[PDB]
């Protein structure tokens, strides 16, 4: 019931590292500035699955905590040579893109994060398969997929893709095709972990597991109401601190709370915390799991 | 000299049909979602009476 979707925990960088235009408006996010690259992030019909879980991570603070790691290149020029390896796994994805967007960062296969560039001044379209040319053009990125990132470091590189009776879904050439092989366009749950591939899903079993930890408290700074208030000044049981910080029983039990002599009000972020999944029987702990619309291949005869 | 001939395959007793339905067996897939309490829409009172169209 906390209001605090803006509040990002961690830094609060969206920004990415390759369309770093952006960064004058987006350091640190907080309830001020106009980032592009999280303001969809929020709107009524476009990802619920964020506006659910808004309490963690995105993909590009996963990426700036060194979580998940960047392809070679990061950002694949569209105008520059003749071939470029982020365009076969950019065409078999169907996404709708609004006007007024440059870039537009997507998952990768090998685990990694590859997104595409577009020179000045070019926009995309109405499903960002192609940037054609000419509000103002945002400076940023469009998020292609409903993914959430976290704080994980669990390993898993010994899974591969759990889907039966499918030829080749997106990119990866899993089984042989014989006889009839579909292609529409439809959604598929995948998970990737700590240097793995993207592995698919089939079967998903979400719950919410919080914790004390020092990246699932939202606040916001008091003064004569939601303001920016960073929270590492916050002084622990007994020891040292900078300014001041105060809460409820949850803040307040593993930091010092100083009532009306504060210049905050630290707050447990609901559903913040360690949300692990359970794939093959197995619980676990992903890293930025989410859908995704691809080609699937599915055997019906 | 014009013949029309009519030839007989044999006695045959076809069933007349009248109500028809396509069944089959099923197996429900069935997906979990523990949300917290006062998280988001996990609530006491609005977990409890939820609807199944909705």
């Excluded at chain 1, 994980?152 to 997106?170: A, N, P, W």
Aim: charged share 25%; net charge positive.
């Amino acid at each position: 019931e906390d209001p605090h979707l803006r509040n990002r925990p961690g830094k609060g960088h969206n920004y990415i590292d390759g369309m770093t235009q952006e960064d004058a408006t987006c350091k640190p996010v907080t309830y001020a500035g106009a980032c592009s690259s999280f303001d969809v992030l929020l709107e009524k019909g476009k990802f619920p699955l964020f506006q659910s879980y808004a309490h963690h991570r995105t993909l590009l603070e996963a990426v700036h905590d060194t979580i998940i790691a960047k392809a070679d290149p990061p950002s694949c020029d569209l105008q520059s040579a003749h071939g470029n390896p982020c365009m076969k796994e950019k065409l078999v994805m169907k996404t709708h893109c609004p006007n007024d967007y440059q870039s537009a960062h997507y998952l990768n296969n090998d685990g990694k994060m590859a997104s595409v560039k577009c020179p000045p001044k070019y926009e995309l379209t109405e499903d960002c398969n192609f940037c054609r040319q000419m509000a103002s053009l945002k400076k940023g990125s469009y998020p292609l997929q409903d993914l959430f990132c976290q704080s994980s470091e669990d390993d898993g590189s010994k899974l591969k893709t759990k889907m039966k009776g499918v030829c080749e879904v997106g990119v990866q050439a899993l089984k042989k095709c014989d006889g009839q092989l579909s292609t529409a366009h439809e959604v598929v749950p995948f998970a990737v972990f700590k240097n793995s591939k993207k592995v698919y899903l089939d079967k998903l079993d979400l719950k919410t597991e919080e914790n004390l930890l020092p990246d699932s408290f939202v606040c916001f700074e008091h003064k004569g109401e939601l303001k920016s208030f960073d929270i590492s000044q916050c002084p622990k049981i007994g020891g040292h601190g900078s300014k001041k910080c105060t809460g409820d029983a949850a803040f307040c039990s593993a930091y010092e709370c100083t009532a009306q002599y504060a210049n905050a009000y630290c707050s447990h972020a609901n559903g913040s915390g360690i949300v692990q999944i359970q794939v093959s029987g197995v619980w676990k702990k992903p890293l930025c799991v989410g859908y995704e619309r691809v080609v699937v291949k599915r055997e019906l005869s | 000299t014009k013949f029309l001939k009519i030839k007989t395959v044999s006695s045959e007793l076809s069933c007349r049909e009248g109500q028809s339905y396509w069944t089959g067996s099923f197996s429900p897939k069935c997906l979990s979602s523990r949300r917290c309490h006062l998280v988001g829409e996990c609530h006491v009172n609005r977990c409890l009476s939820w609807r199944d169209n909705e």
